[PDB]
């Protein structure tokens, strides 16, 4: 029995709204929501991030095109629905305003944990760790290249969490990241279902071994870290979903940042002066092998012409597709064990002609190619600035933390000044609880410390970590 | 869309691990003509050139086809450290 | 043995004076604060009517220290001569272990001392310059420790031809010390016996040194533009 | 007036060669309410955690205080090895 009233939550964490509500006061908790995050820092700073090319889109720009694709996905789908009347059977009859507008901050929020540079920033910080953890010889009974005395297997119900410490700190994904963001770091407080539609993947990040193959896709990267074990569990007794599960709508996000993947690139590319409107249109036509789409547009045009209906035409082909697809499995995505993506036929193929023009043409720039090298450099100098941090012994950082005013520590204080205030509050909240007379303290806190340093790296926007990097090596 | 940073590092982890036992691993990949899904094909062999066995995996997923290539490897190494 | 000079006294305490008075008024000139925040700031740590309220009705920027520093002074120069004057045999002799500078004189300075290193020597820019003087200086080092790692005879061959074919590096960063520091060096080998067991320690000291000296030697400024020049960054 | 880079790197020298006898220091330090100077405990014990002996050493002096600290860290590795 499909009923949506048991998947749209309106309860927050923290001083949740009880009672019964109406109609109206219910849409007035999800415009709070919206204007908490359309408000946050954490989307200011997407304008100072690249998505390409350093009149170019950036990634606020980006995700606000995202937005507007989700918005009459769902759209779509909520009319065809009222078509076969079938709204009030699956008590959509009185949350069609929310429907839409969890879609929307989803689409939104879908890349506020990316890390500076981007992809090749995610890979600087996991080689690092990787050098320092060697989480490969953990895997079995004890060998060990590990560089913490703490961390070395050496005590059966003491080596897993060794072990899994050692794994979940070599795994650092975006995806997770947001989750942590949005929860302990800046505070929002959002609805449980605000929250579920930005858990992408399932897996743990501290997952060793071969997943099961009832969920070999919905678990292929990692979906959260351990410190929010606690925080999913609850968020998944709230939502009634299963272990290694999904939310209903977070289909329809996935589905539209498929479709704005390639396009916005190409014309950026044009603005460039990399090639004219004439050679893409050239390149376009040998790649196909297009006349209800690209020929319809080419012909209603030049530069700003030639795209404003190209988009108009993909999207009046993909759009109906999405949502046909949606209405046809249904309980399996309601269920949240759907193992399939919403996008083999003629429009699935029409996305690949945009994906091998763009990876041949625009991605191979030597322009494009140079910045992914210099962010890989700056990433791995700012961890070894910081260093000295993860050197100190538990007694030591406690009195930096506690005093402030070390005589001891010179160097090692002023570079704990610099961290952002919201982290250290963070890292104090968690050490805060665990129990001290415990033989598990040290890992912990070492686990701790290793996510305030990850966290304070994250959080940077591209120009502010260069800057920042030729200023500690003593050249600007 | 592109290839996840760990499931890379995985896959070197176990041809690594796998090449501790004075082995060695090729590598093939290409595109399919019809199936519309990426194809990669190993092979296992010792240094003296003879040829084990071979596996094949196709996937439209780059991640999903990486993990599948993995845990094969883990599996070859388990069973032929199960005895030699 | 191990004695001072009587009028060292003299110095030590007129240090002490001037040790975070000029910093504070420094700070206002940056605008880390305004005069008001200041005086607030020292009437809530002081827990002062007669040095720092004399000041303060008397103004508003150039006239609040100028006060001040006259206040503090007329309280301070005459219990140091007093001290001086007392302990006159102890001095004299040069075994006085202790200083001019317990009472309502010492506890007065402390104020200062206290809220110049809360709200001033704590400041993001002026911690910032303290780390990259830290990587500049190492990095100076690391650049001439080729000139540490060579024999006796090769240094000598260095310091006398100036001409060396066997060492191009090696010669062309002993032309970038300055010719007093190696005069210096050379009037200082030119004594020791030659033929002593001892040549070439004293020697190895004397080389640490000279590359010391040249180091110490130099303004803020010009080590930076070095460092940089020697890097290939600039 | 700020504390000499020398007497820290000796204090630091202290406490490892007393460390490299299996041994651990614990460092307090504030200010005391009328006296006025500061003051540092020490507390030496094993890594079982059984204190051996205490001490504290109240001076308003940087300089002095921690050359106090560093020749009583050294006595007490003198005594600690003069015996066990
Ligand atoms: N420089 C560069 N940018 C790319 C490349 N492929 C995609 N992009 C850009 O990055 C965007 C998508 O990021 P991807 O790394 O492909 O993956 P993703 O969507 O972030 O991944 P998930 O969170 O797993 O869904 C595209 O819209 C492009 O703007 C590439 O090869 N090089
Ligand atoms: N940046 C910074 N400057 C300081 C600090 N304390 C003092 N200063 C400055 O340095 C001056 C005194 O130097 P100190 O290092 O305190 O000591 P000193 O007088 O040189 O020392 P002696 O030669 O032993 O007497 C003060 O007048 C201030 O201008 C501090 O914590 N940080
Ligand atoms: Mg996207
Ligand atoms: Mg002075």
């Given at each position: 029995?499909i009923?949506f009233?048991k998947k749209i939550?309106?309860?927050?964490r923290?001083?949740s709204?009880?009672?019964?509500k ?7 908790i ?6 908490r995050?359309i ?5 200011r700073?997407?304008?100072?991030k690249?998505?390409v090319?350093?009149?170019?889109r ?5 995700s ?9 996905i ?6 065809r629905?009222?078509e ?10 009185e949350l ?7 879609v ?13 540079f981007?992809?090749?920033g ?5 080689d690092?760790?990787r050098?320092?953890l060697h ?7 004890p060998?060990?290249?590990?560089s913490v005395?703490?961390?070395?297997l050496?005590?059966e119900?003491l080596?897993e ?7 979940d700190?070599c ?6 990241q947001?989750?942590r963001?949005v929860?302990?770091?800046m505070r929002?407080?959002l ?12 897996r743990?990040?501290?997952?060793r071994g071969?997943?099961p193959?009832?969920h070999?896709?919905?678990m ?5 870290y ?5 925080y ?11 272990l290694?599960?999904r939310?209903?709508?977070?289909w329809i996000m996935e589905a539209?940042?498929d479709?704005s993947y390639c396009?916005?690139d190409?014309?950026?590319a ?7 409107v004439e ?16 020929e ?10 030639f795209?404003?209906?190209?988009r108009?035409?993909?999207l009046?082909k993909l759009?109906p ?11 399996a995505?309601?269920?949240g064990?759907?193992?399939?993506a919403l ?5 699935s193929?029409?996305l690949?002609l945009?994906?091998?023009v763009?990876?041949?043409?625009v991605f191979?720039?030597?322009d494009?190619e140079?910045?992914?090298?210099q962010?890989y ?7 070894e600035i910081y ?14 933390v506690?005093?402030?005013r070390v005589?001891?520590?010179?160097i090692?204080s002023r ?7 919201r982290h250290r509050l963070?890292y104090?909240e ?9 033989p598990?303290?040290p890992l912990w806190?070492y686990?701790?410390?290793c ?13 502010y970590?260069?800057?920042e990097?030729?200023?500690?090596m003593?050249v600007? | 869309?592109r ?5 890379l590092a995985?896959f070197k982890?176990?041809t ?5 036992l ?6 093939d ?5 019809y ?8 092979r296992?062999?010792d240094?003296?050139?003879n ?10 997923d780059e991640?999903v ?6 845990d ?5 190494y388990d069973?032929?450290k199960?005895?030699?």
């Amino acid at each position: 029995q499909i009923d949506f009233r048991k998947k749209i939550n309106w309860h927050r964490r923290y001083r949740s709204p009880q009672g019964v509500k109406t109609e109206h006061e219910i849409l007035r908790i999800f415009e709070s929501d919206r204007g908490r995050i359309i408000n946050s820092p954490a989307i200011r700073r997407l304008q100072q991030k690249t998505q390409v090319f350093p009149a170019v889109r950036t990634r606020l720009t980006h995700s606000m095109e995202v937005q507007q694709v989700g918005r009459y996905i769902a759209k779509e789908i909520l009319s065809r629905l009222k078509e076969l009347k079938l709204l009030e059977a699956y008590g959509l009859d009185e949350l069609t305003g929310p429907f839409e507008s969890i879609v929307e901050m989803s689409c939104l929020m879908h890349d506020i944990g990316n890390p500076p540079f981007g992809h090749f920033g995610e890979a600087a910080i996991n080689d690092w760790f990787r050098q320092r953890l060697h989480p490969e010889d953990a895997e079995s009974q004890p060998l060990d290249r590990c560089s913490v005395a703490a961390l070395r297997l050496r005590e059966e119900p003491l080596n897993e969490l060794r072990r899994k410490i050692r794994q979940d700190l070599c795994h650092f994904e975006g995806n997770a990241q947001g989750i942590r963001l949005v929860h302990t770091l800046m505070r929002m407080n959002l609805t449980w279902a605000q929250v579920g539609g930005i858990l992408k993947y399932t897996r743990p990040a501290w997952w060793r071994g071969e997943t099961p193959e009832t969920h070999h896709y919905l678990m292929k990267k990692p979906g959260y870290y351990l410190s929010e074990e606690a925080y999913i569990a609850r968020l998944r007794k709230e939502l009634n979903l299963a272990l290694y599960s999904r939310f209903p709508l977070t289909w329809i996000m996935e589905a539209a940042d498929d479709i704005s993947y390639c396009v916005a690139d190409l014309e950026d590319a044009v603005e460039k002066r990399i090639f004219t409107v004439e050679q893409l249109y050239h390149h376009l036509h040998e790649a196909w092998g297009f006349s209800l789409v690209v020929e319809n547009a080419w012909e209603k045009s030049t530069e700003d012409q030639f795209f404003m209906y190209l988009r108009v035409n993909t999207l009046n082909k993909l759009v109906p597709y999405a949502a046909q697809r949606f209405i046809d499995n249904l309980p399996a995505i309601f269920a949240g064990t759907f193992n399939h993506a919403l996008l083999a036929s003629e429009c699935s193929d029409l996305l690949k002609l945009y994906k091998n023009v763009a990876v041949k043409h625009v991605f191979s720039h030597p322009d494009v190619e140079r910045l992914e090298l210099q962010g890989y450099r700056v990433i791995s100098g700012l961890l070894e600035i910081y260093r000295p941090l993860l050197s100190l012994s538990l007694s030591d950082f406690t009195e930096l933390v506690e005093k402030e005013r070390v005589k001891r520590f010179p160097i090692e204080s002023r570079l704990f000044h610099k961290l952002s205030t919201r982290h250290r509050l963070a890292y104090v909240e968690a050490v805060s609880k665990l129990p001290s007379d415990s033989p598990e303290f040290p890992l912990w806190e070492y686990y701790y410390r290793c996510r305030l340093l990850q966290d304070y790296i994250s959080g940077m926007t591209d120009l502010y970590a260069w800057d920042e990097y030729r200023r500690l090596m003593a050249v600007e | 869309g592109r290839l996840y940073s760990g499931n890379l590092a995985a896959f070197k982890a176990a041809t690594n691990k796998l090449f501790q036992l004075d082995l060695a691993v090729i590598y093939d990949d290409w595109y399919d003509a019809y199936t519309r899904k990426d194809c990669i094909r190993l092979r296992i062999e010792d240094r003296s050139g003879n040829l084990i066995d071979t596996s094949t995996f196709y996937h439209h997923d780059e991640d999903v086809l990486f993990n599948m290539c993995t845990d094969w490897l883990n599996h070859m190494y388990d069973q032929l450290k199960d005895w030699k």
